[PDB]
Amino acid sequence: AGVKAYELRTKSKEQLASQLVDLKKELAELKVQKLSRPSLPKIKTVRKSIACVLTVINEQQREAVRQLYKGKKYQPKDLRAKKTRALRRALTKFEASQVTEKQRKKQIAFPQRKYAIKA
Amino acid sequence: SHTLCNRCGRRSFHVQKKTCSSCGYPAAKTRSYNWGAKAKRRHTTGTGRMRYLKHVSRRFKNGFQTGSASK
Amino acid sequence: SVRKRKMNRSSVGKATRRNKDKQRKINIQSNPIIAANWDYSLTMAQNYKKLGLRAKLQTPAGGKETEVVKKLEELASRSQSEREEEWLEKLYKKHGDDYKKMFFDKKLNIYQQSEGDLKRRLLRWKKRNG
Amino acid sequence: SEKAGHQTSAESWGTGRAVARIPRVGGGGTGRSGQGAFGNMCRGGRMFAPTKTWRKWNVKVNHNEKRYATASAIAATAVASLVLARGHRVEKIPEIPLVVSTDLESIQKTKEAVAALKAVGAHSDLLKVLKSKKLRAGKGKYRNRRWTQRRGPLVVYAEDNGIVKALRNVPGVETANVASLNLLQLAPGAHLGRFVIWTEAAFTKLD
Amino acid sequence: AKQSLDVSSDRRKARKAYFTAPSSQRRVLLSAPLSKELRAQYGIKALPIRRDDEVLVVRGSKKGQEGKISSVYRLKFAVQVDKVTKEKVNGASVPINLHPSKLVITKLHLDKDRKALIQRKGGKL
Amino acid sequence: VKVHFDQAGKKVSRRNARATRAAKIAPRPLDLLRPVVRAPTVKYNRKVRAGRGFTLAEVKAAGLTAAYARTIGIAVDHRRQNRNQEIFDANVQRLKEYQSKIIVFPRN
Amino acid sequence: NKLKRQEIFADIKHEKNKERHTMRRKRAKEERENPELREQRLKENVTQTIENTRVY
Amino acid sequence: EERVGRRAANLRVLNSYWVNQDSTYKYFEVILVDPQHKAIRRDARYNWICDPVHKHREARGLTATGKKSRGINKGHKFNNTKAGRRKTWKRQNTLSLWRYRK
RNA sequence: CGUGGAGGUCAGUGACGAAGCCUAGACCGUAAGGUCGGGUCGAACGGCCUCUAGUGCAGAUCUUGGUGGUAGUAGC
RNA sequence: AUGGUGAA
RNA sequence: GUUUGACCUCAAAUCAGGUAGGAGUACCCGCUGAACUUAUAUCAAUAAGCGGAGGAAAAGAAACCAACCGGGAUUGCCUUAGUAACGCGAGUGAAGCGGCAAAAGCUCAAAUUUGAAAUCUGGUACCUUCGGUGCCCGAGUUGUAAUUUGGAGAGGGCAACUUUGGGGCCGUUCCUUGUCUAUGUUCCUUGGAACAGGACGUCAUAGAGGGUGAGAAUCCCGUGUGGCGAGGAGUGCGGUUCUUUGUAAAGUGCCUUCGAAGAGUCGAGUUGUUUGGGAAUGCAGCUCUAAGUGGGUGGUUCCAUCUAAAGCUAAAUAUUGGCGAGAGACCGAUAGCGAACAAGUACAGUGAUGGAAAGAUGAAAAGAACUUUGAAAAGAGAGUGAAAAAGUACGU
Ligand SMILES: [Zn+2]
């Protein structure tokens, strides 16, 4: 068997670091004993556990960074979206929909009407 | 006569001229000409790995959605 | 196409899309009455003729009241600010109905409005009061 | 493909080499070097007179000639001997041309439609289809042309109320309107006298 | 005759899709009919076949043989049934590959997911 | 060499676009109201054809202003002048018929 | 790939045949040294002829 | 315009005018608009320049001087060059064929 | 006369064997070619009216591929 | 002819 | 005041907020650009090279076309038309009108808000965050806020004038996406295997298609029609509503007073380029350089049309590149893209570059257990498989 992400989600940073250190030590010991046996499948399991622990730690760090950057604009680029280079620029919806006073007055005075031509 | 090129490693880096006769290194623009259709094909996008360009089409199909599922 | 061959060979998976059927299938979404009566089986011109609504005002190129009453059925189906009301009250119980005198009221008529505008505003205020 | 053949790079050695003057590929080591190219006689070379997209595909036909052909095809359907010579099993039809009551157009279920067709002597024609189903002969088996079958009876209606959908699934049977009366359906393979099952409304509207 | 324009009646496309279909799709592909006795019970004709299910062979040289499925070979588009093996000349026993479409299910291995699927498919339990 | 192999495809695309426009524009007749115009060049001086839009004078005579007329799907031309008092009368009659035959829904 | 399949299995057959030949030679030498081993092997190995495998 | 645009890549060329001249040099004043600035982006009268289609207008000759140099104007004076000097070659050198030959 | 494909047609042929190939087998036609007798073969093809062409080889110091005399010779 | 490569 | 501070200019910051490089390149927009090929003409405003964006690009609402009873953005097709015109040979070669597809018009400059720079960038605290409010600072008066582009337009008075915005919720439209929705495996013959023939049943708005030991509607996956969901885009619209705000804004007719239009620009001159263009129009260097009842474009001694030297705009339009789909009277391993397979791979070249050969066992490896001659390779027995006259050198 192996560790589960949801189980680690309920552990503090220090506990996650200790678990990561223990798993790394176990992986190193297994690697030192790799030639002792023809094949030990537990190496893959411990590697997957280490990867999951690292992912959980990175997620916690990123959530903390987001929390400490809450509210203020111009947040670090990494936390921003990754749509594409072209879509980031070019008149975001509010700027695109902006209308001058004259055009707004003309639209309000003479808005497009719905009608039918039989009677 | 020639050495491996850092940009492409084609072994076409002229020591005397300190430039690559294939990709044009260290020129800013990668060397390529219309008459060299075979040369263009040999270096056309897709021959390599396309680490980021591969998933662009898949991401667009989802509208560049951001977040996570709701279960 | 080198890119097409790589994509087909790659295990990433094509972002498959299917919208050919929806090109022919169009849903009317500009009127509730028409939507409940529109027949997708018939063509746009055929549906317009069935509902009685003209499709093309000009003569169509080439060769060639059941529901209209519903639209006609639905076809047949301001206030003054507190400060403005107070100012009109001062005009009233300073001059009454003599708009000519009110036109020269420097103290109350801060803005030199015409007699017609003053009388119209006074009538509007009266309509909502005694 | 236009680029076919011309992709290879080759040049003519010329006289003095005691070999054919056909252009040959340059280079060496790959084996392809020295191989002839740029010729319909050469393997992998450009084919003589490559086929081009701008070949005349469609053929213009006079409208009056089309109307005459359609009228002749329709008239050929009223002759039992001519229809029999077309291969349709009309030996047991009550009358020719066959006219059915207008209620036929209102049939929705396929079972009812096929039962009605069988009851009017069209059972033999229907059975003719689904028995001649044979695999395509030649290279057309793998070009979306695997299966071929004999044409079934044709049903003509003044207006559609479900008959077209009812008879769509049954093999061989085809449905058409009086306004169109497709010549291809009427006379498949440039052959006159197809078995057509008309309707009272369609018969009246034909006038 | 097809009516939707989003479905292609091309032999080449169907052949390419079938051979390159993923395991998840192959699970739907590897479906076998249920015995009429079970059909009256659950009111369902065919269900996906899994290892724990018991099936009966009704086609091929091994007709009339029934047993539990040892494994589901999705890669080879075949399944293996217990007691259905080919005895090699060396004494080894090799299970005989069988397509699920040629086998009739005599018993079904019930589970929460299996019961949910049966209910979703209009069946009764 | 260019060959129009997409004639049927182009026709289908145009029909689909018109159907989509009708779906988006259900009550209006997919277009505006055009005037009657006499063609020039002698050879066509005796031919009457649809124009771009009614003149300002025609719209004013019809009983409505150009700004409001444009919202009722009436084409208005600000550069076309009136010189013969028969096409003007025909256009006025056409505009009156259009006004009589139109039903306008309220804003709310 | 046809060439890959042909080449890979061609080498495998040669190695298998060489190993079988060496094993058979060593077994023959040991049987010459110890004939009883040949009898023990024969008592457990049968040619499994069609006649010997009658199905009653 | 091209010289100023190349150096000021982030800027967009809007127009230019003459200011002074010399026996050895001629001086022109060029106006450029920064589409990145939020003031221009939120300005309806000028937010159109932010569209990517208007990138390097002077390079494609879309400016007042560029359009004039292309001979794009209404009148018989520019009939032969109404829509450029390149598309005409494609128009005249293309043999149009229909499904049913005319 | 013959072939690639298509519309029609024989409710055609065919795992009780379709195509191809071989045949010191015969039959039919002046011929292009077609039919059948026998062996291998295994899963498509043909009788006939039309449409269609990348449609028929004895050579082009022809192209791709395969095999001989020279020759177990010169030669290493 | 155009675009590039090398060099007692 | 022998002194301080402002305006203007010039530099530094690993200061805060921002952007351009390149790749791709079939289509577009500009510069540049030859020869073979044919008797300045012509290949040819082509090939190649250079710079710039997109899903289309340019152009686009006349200093237009016309001399008619006048038409009224640009764009693409037919037609005009192989005509005018040029060259007068060879040949090149348009455009108005007419029909079709689609139609949306607008944004600045120019006359004082002056009884109130009322405008906006940026920092900060909050909120209902593609943003909103309060405060602060700066940009701006060498002009940011209202209106107007001759189609005029503006300041006032009279209609017993007319009219009015903002934000959520669910529905509705679209995108992604999961799922349900009919019928034999009945009998006989043959076959290794029935998916083959005959007999008897059933569904068909589902007999397109694929797989299952050989041609399967009824074995499965699937197709026809409908049903049930989940996550996103959006104000295209129907309700539900919470707000409205203020002597606030807009539209029509009448009466009065005003009433502003783009200069090294047109044009002439001169030197090169472009067209088959006779009024080189158009574009390119430069001496010169104008008026506002004016100027441009034309035909007749007068009249006809427009208002250039500023800009934006979806539509019909192109597409051998990209993503994703539907098809072929197309080729079928010497064919078809060079590449059906370890194909731009092996391989050759100091390098720009060139560049192939290679598909199929058998249904299932059941891939020959075991004996035996064999430096190693192959055989002889024996055996699976319908076939080894299918041996991983395998469809014939
Ligand atoms: Zn390089």
UniProtKB/Swiss-Prot annotation, chain C:
Protein's GO biological process: ribosomal large subunit biogenesis; rRNA processing
More details: Present with 2860 molecules/cell in log phase SD medium.
The organism's place on the tree of life at top rank: Eukaryota
Protein name as it appears in the record: Nucleolar protein 16
Biological role stated in the UniProt entry: Involved in the biogenesis of the 60S ribosomal subunit.
Similarity remark: Belongs to the NOP16 family.
Subunit structure: Component of the pre-66S ribosomal particle. Interacts with NOP7, RRP1 and RRP15.
Biased composition (Basic residues): 1-8, 15-25
Curated annotation (Swiss-Prot), chain D:
One term of GO molecular function: RNA binding
Entry comment on modification after translation: N-terminally acetylated by acetyltransferase NatA.
Keywords: Acetylation, Cytoplasm, Methylation, Nucleus, Ribonucleoprotein, Ribosomal protein, RNA-binding
A GO term from the CC aspect: nucleus
Effect in UniProt of substituting R46E: Leads to a slower growth at higher temperatures but allows RPL4 assembly into the 60S subunit
Chief location of this protein within or outside the cell: cytoplasm
GO biological process: cytoplasmic translation
Residue numbers of Omega-N-methylarginine PTMs: R43
Note: There are 2 genes for uL4 in yeast.
Membership in a protein family: Belongs to the universal ribosomal protein uL4 family.
Assembly mode: Component of the large ribosomal subunit (LSU). Mature yeast ribosomes consist of a small (40S) and a large (60S) subunit. The 40S small subunit contains 1 molecule of ribosomal RNA (18S rRNA) and 33 different proteins (encoded by 57 genes). The large 60S subunit contains 3 rRNA molecules (25S, 5.8S and 5S rRNA) and 46 different proteins (encoded by 81 genes). uL4 is associated with the polypeptide exit tunnel. uL4 interacts with its chaperone ACL4 and the nuclear import receptor KAP104.
Record-given protein name: Large ribosomal subunit protein uL4A
Taxonomic source organism: Saccharomyces cerevisiae (strain ATCC 204508 / S288c)
Gene name of this polypeptide: RPL4A
UniProtKB/Swiss-Prot annotation, chain G:
Composition-biased stretches (Basic and acidic residues): 28-37
Origin superkingdom: Eukaryota
Compartments, record wording: Nucleus, Nucleolus
Chain residue ranges for the region called Disordered: 14-37
Note: Present with 784 molecules/cell in log phase SD medium.
Subunit organization: Part of a complex that includes BRX1, RPF1, RPF2 and SSF1 or SSF2.
Record's function text: Essential protein. Required for biogenesis of the 60S ribosomal subunit.
Protein's UniProt name: Ribosome production factor 1
Organism encoding this protein: Saccharomyces cerevisiae (strain ATCC 204508 / S288c)
Gene: RPF1
From Swiss-Prot, chain H:
Purpose of the protein: Component of the ribosome, a large ribonucleoprotein complex responsible for the synthesis of proteins in the cell. The small ribosomal subunit (SSU) binds messenger RNAs (mRNAs) and translates the encoded message by selecting cognate aminoacyl-transfer RNA (tRNA) molecules. The large subunit (LSU) contains the ribosomal catalytic site termed the peptidyl transferase center (PTC), which catalyzes the formation of peptide bonds, thereby polymerizing the amino acids delivered by tRNAs into a polypeptide chain.
Compositionally biased tracts (Basic residues): 67-83
Organism phylogeny: Eukaryota, Fungi, Dikarya, Ascomycota, Saccharomycotina
A Gene Ontology BP annotation from the UniProt entry: cytoplasmic translation
Stated name of the protein: Large ribosomal subunit protein eL15A
Family that this chain belongs to: Belongs to the eukaryotic ribosomal protein eL15 family.
Organism per entry: Saccharomyces cerevisiae (strain ATCC 204508 / S288c)
Any one Gene Ontology cellular component term annotated for this protein: cytosol
Self-association state and partner proteins as the record states: Component of the large ribosomal subunit (LSU). Mature yeast ribosomes consist of a small (40S) and a large (60S) subunit. The 40S small subunit contains 1 molecule of ribosomal RNA (18S rRNA) and 33 different proteins (encoded by 57 genes). The large 60S subunit contains 3 rRNA molecules (25S, 5.8S and 5S rRNA) and 46 different proteins (encoded by 81 genes).
Keywords, ordered alphabetically: Cytoplasm, Ribonucleoprotein, Ribosomal protein
Extra remark beyond the main annotation: There are 2 genes for eL15 in yeast.
Shown chain mapped onto the complete sequence: 103 to 204 of 204
Name of the gene: RPL15A
Region (Disordered): 62-83
The keyword Ribonucleoprotein appears for this protein: yes
Localisation per UniProt entry: Cytoplasm
